[PDB]
């Protein structure tokens, strides 16, 4: 009667926060580009036709973009990725040759400090007796000389060991879909104005997020998902200067970028098996690569953003815009890959202003490296194969990662600089939204019920 | 007033809804519960958790007075320590995950006397009932 | 985010029908039922019917009963409404509008669709 | 059917002013009864429901009283944004009947 019994429930809303082995979804056309497996998709599970978003009604969860696990996870997933990607490839051990290089066909001036040099050097070839004395082209950035002509030697010779990619895979940027097992729900936040950190209002639940193409980049957020209404401005803590601001733009601003230098593909053979594809020699004229970003889309851009800043800041208050303080060629240049190159471009032009309280392109100097070692790794070094042809691309520039100085002369005005370093902060910019929960559906509650006696 | 039918709110639909309204949707969040080289390794020892989560319930489930999934009832009296609470303060005020927070303390207390005190000297009294 | 979109404008000829549809963005499409109403040119508002889109079971009002038909695809989160034998007199603005429904009963229209302006005319 | 008389038809009311429009019905309807606000050119807006509750976000200026055949909206003080014609439906039984409209217009 009234006094009351305890009666089970299974299949109740109930969850609790928990951190879960998520696996990938990437569609089905994703699957169809071959090309012998480019990027992932090998053995990833197709895609739902008709992913499904319940809007939970009246449901308010509290979300933490700065220490959710599903960027810890991604992280080390594609890192693992790049270790098997690279284990059937070619390796370039006997490559440490000394190389006797000199500048590369042009004329003068005095200014073009080479960049580009035309090295010799011996090889071995498929037997294992004769030599070779081949010749091939590389980027300044990836050859140190070491001390009759002037000799080189490859930059991670004295650092690692070194991985040619196999030219049959792609470094082309695929969506792929997180979703979470069988008893597990990955919720979603649906607030058109949501600074990552605290309740949500509009919750809904999914079991596949959207698709979010791994782009690897440094301080410009290219190809992301664009905020809703006004800008927004993310940070872990905005009183501490040595924590980044992860800033989502809401229009995209048109980046051009390529590669005006038709090289030529020499495939020379290191057997047996094995064969490197060096760079030979260039049709056309010596330029550097560069990308292109309107004036008049920048402008807006920044100035969306400085006001934006201001209500952090201060309503009257003066924020300059300075390049980066120094270290890495990772960390001081928009770092980014285009056609299977490494550019380096530098943001000197980008970040030069400064705005108070109240018709061209722009062109940016780009470098190009082929030997990178990537995530902060030491012992694995990848070798770009070179692309034929000049290489074209246009993205969209969808975010920032920026660092406060310390200096300070704090009430009066703030310097913002470009910096990075940790790609994990690129994966919390999609995953800002999405946070992974465990379900609970045993649920005990009292009622006026009593069982039998088996009357 | 006129209306059209009942209507469907999905998986975890209920959530923020009262307990007794979502008693409702029992059937919806049972039924994706359990859903039919590496990294191709990293599917499966998800997809074996999953119905060791599954079985674990189902164990529970059985070794109470229940099997018989959804809602079942029990001989246990609810002690009023445990957030003394009405009847219509709870099923017509109160949500699934609000309650679990606060009966989160005494869960694992109501889980023993309901496998111990019951199905083992209920069982055990239905083995003296049926042999006359 | 919980919106309803509809289909743009449209003209037909007297005596023809129109299929006019709604999507339900931000929410979950079969957990509420959802009214048509129209608005002639400087007039007040007319209700047709409303169907759920959960079972698809319909009710019109009496005026419209073999009419007006209203039908929905759930996969794509989207309702119809066909509006036949078509005169003068069906020019207007027709919205979709999704009840509250609590108590799986009608309790008031909280979130409408932009309308879709339909002129029939020779 | 049942029909929804509004009364006045047509409002005229300055900035501040306190005002209540009528909503009659030709049957009782008990508490089964919504308010609605619509700008030209716009769909309408949901105020009120069951007759006295006020729809989320919607403002606190705005309550609503009555039940049966007799009821009323009142706006405690009027701001530029609530000049507009204003609605009231039943949905006891079918079908479903809106009121003729108020509109509220600025006086000068």
């Known amino acids: 009667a009234e006094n009351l019994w305890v009666t089970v429930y299974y299949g109740v809303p109930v969850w609790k926060d928990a951190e879960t082995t998520l696996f990938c979804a990437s569609d089905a056309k994703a699957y169809e580009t071959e090309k012998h497996n480019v990027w992932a998709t090998h053995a990833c599970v197709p895609t739902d036709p008709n992913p499904q978003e319940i809007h939970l009604e009246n449901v308010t969860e509290e979300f933490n973009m700065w220490k959710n696990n599903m960027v810890e996870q991604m992280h080390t997933d594609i890192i693992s990725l790049w270790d098997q990607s690279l284990k059937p490839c070619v390796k370039l051990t006997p490559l440490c040759v000394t190389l006797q290089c000199t500048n590369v066909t042009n004329n003068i001036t005095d200014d073009m400090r080479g960049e580009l040099k035309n090295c010799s050097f011996n090889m071995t070839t498929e037997l294992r007796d004769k030599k070779q004395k081949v010749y091939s082209l590389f980027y300044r950035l990836d050859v140190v000389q070491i001390n009759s002509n002037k000799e080189y030697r490859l930059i991670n010779c004295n650092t690692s060991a070194i991985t040619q990619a196999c030219p049959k895979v792609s470094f082309e940027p695929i969506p792929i879909h997180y979703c979470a097992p069988a008893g597990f729900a990955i919720l979603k936040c649906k607030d058109k104005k949501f600074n990552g950190t605290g309740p949500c209002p509009s919750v809904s639940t999914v079991q596949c997020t959207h698709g979010i193409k791994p782009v690897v980049s440094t301080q410009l957020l290219l190809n992301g998902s664009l905020a809703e209404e006004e800008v927004m401005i993310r940070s872990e803590n905005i009183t501490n200067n040595a924590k980044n601001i992860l800033v989502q733009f809401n229009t995209p601003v048109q980046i051009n970028c390529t590669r005006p230098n038709n090289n030529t593909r020499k495939s020379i053979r290191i057997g047996p098996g094995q064969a490197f594809y060096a760079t030979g020699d260039i049709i056309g004229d010596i330029r550097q690569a560069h990308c292109n970003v309107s004036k008049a889309t920048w402008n807006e851009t920044l100035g969306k953003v400085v006001k934006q800043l201001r209500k952090h800041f201060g309503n009257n208050t003066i924020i300059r815009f300075a390049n980066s303080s120094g270290g890495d060629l990772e960390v001081t240049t928009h770092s980014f890959n285009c056609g299977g190159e490494f550019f380096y471009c530098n943001t000197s032009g980008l970040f030069n202003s400064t705005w108070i309280s109240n018709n061209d392109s722009i062109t940016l100097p780009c470098r190009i490296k082929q030997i990178i070692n990537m995530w902060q790794r030491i012992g694995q070094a990848m070798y770009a194969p070179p692309i034929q042809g000049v290489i074209r691309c246009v993205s969209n520039i969808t975010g920032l990662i920026l660092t406060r100085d310390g200096g300070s002369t704090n009430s009066t005005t703030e310097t913002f600089r470009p910096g990075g370093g940790d790609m994990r902060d690129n994966w919390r910019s999609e995953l800002y939204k999405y946070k992974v929960v465990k379900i609970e559906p045993l649920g005990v509650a009292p009622t006026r019920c009593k069982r039998r006696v088996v009357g | 007033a006129v209306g059209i039918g009942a209507v469907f709110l999905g998986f975890l639909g209920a959530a923020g809804s009262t307990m007794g309204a979502a008693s409702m949707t029992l059937t919806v969040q049972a039924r994706n519960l359990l859903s039919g080289t590496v990294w191709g390794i990293k599917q499966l020892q998800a997809r074996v958790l999953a119905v060791e989560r599954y079985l674990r319930d189902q164990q529970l489930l059985g070794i109470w007075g229940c099997s018989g999934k959804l809602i079942c009832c029990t001989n246990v009296p609810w002690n009023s320590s445990w957030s003394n609470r009405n009847l219509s303060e709870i099923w017509d005020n109160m949500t699934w995950l609000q309650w679990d927070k606060e009966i989160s303390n005494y869960t694992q207390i109501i889980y023993g006397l309901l496998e111990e005190s019951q199905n083992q000297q209920e069982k055990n009294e239905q083995d003296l009932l049926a042999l006359d | 985010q919980e919106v309803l979109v509809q289909s743009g404008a449209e003209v037909k000829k007297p005596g023809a029908s129109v299929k006019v549809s709604c999507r339900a963005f931000?929410?979950?499409?079969?957990?509420?039922?959802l009214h048509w109403v129209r608005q002639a040119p400087g007039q007040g508002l007319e209700w047709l019917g409303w169907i759920n889109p959960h079972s698809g079971d319909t009710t019109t009002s009496q005026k419209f009963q073999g009419r007006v038909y209203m039908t929905r695809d759930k996969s794509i989160n989207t309702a119809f409404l066909d509006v036949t034998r078509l005169t003068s007199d069906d020019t207007g603005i027709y919205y979709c509008?999704?009840?509250?429904?609590?108590?799986?009963?009608?309790?008031?229209?909280?979130?409408w669709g932009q309308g879709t302006s339909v002129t029939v005319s020779s | 059917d049942i029909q929804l008389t509004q009364s006045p038809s047509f409002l005229s009311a300055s900035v501040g002013d306190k005002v209540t429009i009528t909503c009659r019905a030709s049957q009782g309807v008990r508490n089964e009864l919504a308010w609605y606000q619509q700008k030209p050119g716009k769909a309408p807006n949901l105020l009120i429901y069951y007759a006295s509750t006020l729809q989320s976000g919607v403002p606190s200026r705005f309550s609503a009283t009555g039940s049966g055949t007799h009821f009323t909206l009142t706006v405690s003080s009027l701001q530029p944004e609530d000049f507009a014609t204003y609605f009231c439906?039943?949905?006891?039984?079918?079908?479903?009947?809106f009121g003729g409209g108020t509109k509220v217009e600025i006086k000068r």
């Open positions: 931000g929410y979950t499409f079969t957990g509420n039922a």
């Open positions: 439906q039943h949905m006891s039984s079918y079908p479903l009947t």
């Open positions: 509008a999704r009840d509250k429904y609590y108590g799986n009963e009608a309790v008031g229209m909280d979130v």
